[PDB]
Symmetry: C2
Subunit: 177 residues, 2 copies
């Protein structure tokens, strides 16, 4: 097996960068590049987040983002390894987890786009349907969600749907053209 | 990078088993099992090919078959590795190489069938069309093939179509269960 780091470890490891987005959004962005097979472009994007800074903290942040990118690259490209979305732990609040899920999708869709992939690049119709749903998940209002069984289940379902959809989109893009 | 052994070396390595089929057909079978996710079942098949012999030469034949099965498993499951079909080298006759391609396809479609995969197990229409083409390639007249560039590029094109198709078939099966 091969697993992403704990969510809060990752978040702490990039805190010094004072980024404008969540760990989850950032991971969604990485996975957008990787889904499109724009691996080298993803790496360049991560480098760019340092804005040329060269101190040891910034450097350690870079190494951590690269470790995550490489784990994701392997999970997305090897059927022997389960693909994971970097999201807060299950004991966080429903509202925290739902916002992070939405930001994950926003990052992923933006990543795809910046990597030159939209609706027309997909061979399968299942993929286009899925991209559209991810675009809706990205626009999701986390405050409507209500604590209890129903919405926990709802979040769990859309989260698992998104996880698989990313893998199917990736196969579509990679095995055509 | 990770590559299959040379056709000749593999064929020599299994000659002691006196198999009824060619190296290419056997590799097709292996890939049928792998495409279906029936890895353990394929392994038991390969082991049963020794018909319980335990002598050194038979055991080395088995090691060779397992090495090929494992290389294939990795190529089919890791997008970072190129998938290969085990086919005779270019030097050999056009008829001979067309024959081996056909036997590869026959082996492949038999492997799928044995592992419980036919038309209805595939989610995408494209996969179904591809399987149908592969069944036709298995029943292909190799004598008609005229030594020349037209039929040489004809063979190359269905060979490459088959190579890519196998990967798309696999992704269809794994990503819908
Ligand atoms: Na995987
Ligand atoms: Na591969």
């Amino acid at each position: 097996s091969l697993h992403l780091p704990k969510y809060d470890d990752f978040v702490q490891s990039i805190s010094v960068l004072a980024l404008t987005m969540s760990g989850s959004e950032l991971h969604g962005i990485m996975c957008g590049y990787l889904c499109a097979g724009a691996d080298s472009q993803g790496e360049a994007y991560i480098r760019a987040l340092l804005n040329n800074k060269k101190d040891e903290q910034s450097r350690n942040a870079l190494l951590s983002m690269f470790s995550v990118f490489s784990i994701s690259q392997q999970q997305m490209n090897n059927f022997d390894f389960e693909f994971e979305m970097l999201l807060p732990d299950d004991d966080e609040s429903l509202v925290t987890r739902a916002q992070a899920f939405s930001e994950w999708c926003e990052g992923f869709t933006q990543g795809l786009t910046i990597a030159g992939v939209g609706m027309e690049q997909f061979y399968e119709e299942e993929s286009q349907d899925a991209l559209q749903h991810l675009m809706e998940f990205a626009e999701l209002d986390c405050e409507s969600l209500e604590v209890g069984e129903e919405d926990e289940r709802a979040l769990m379902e859309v989260s698992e749907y998104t996880r698989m959809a990313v893998l199917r989109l990736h196969s579509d893009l990679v095995l055509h053209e």
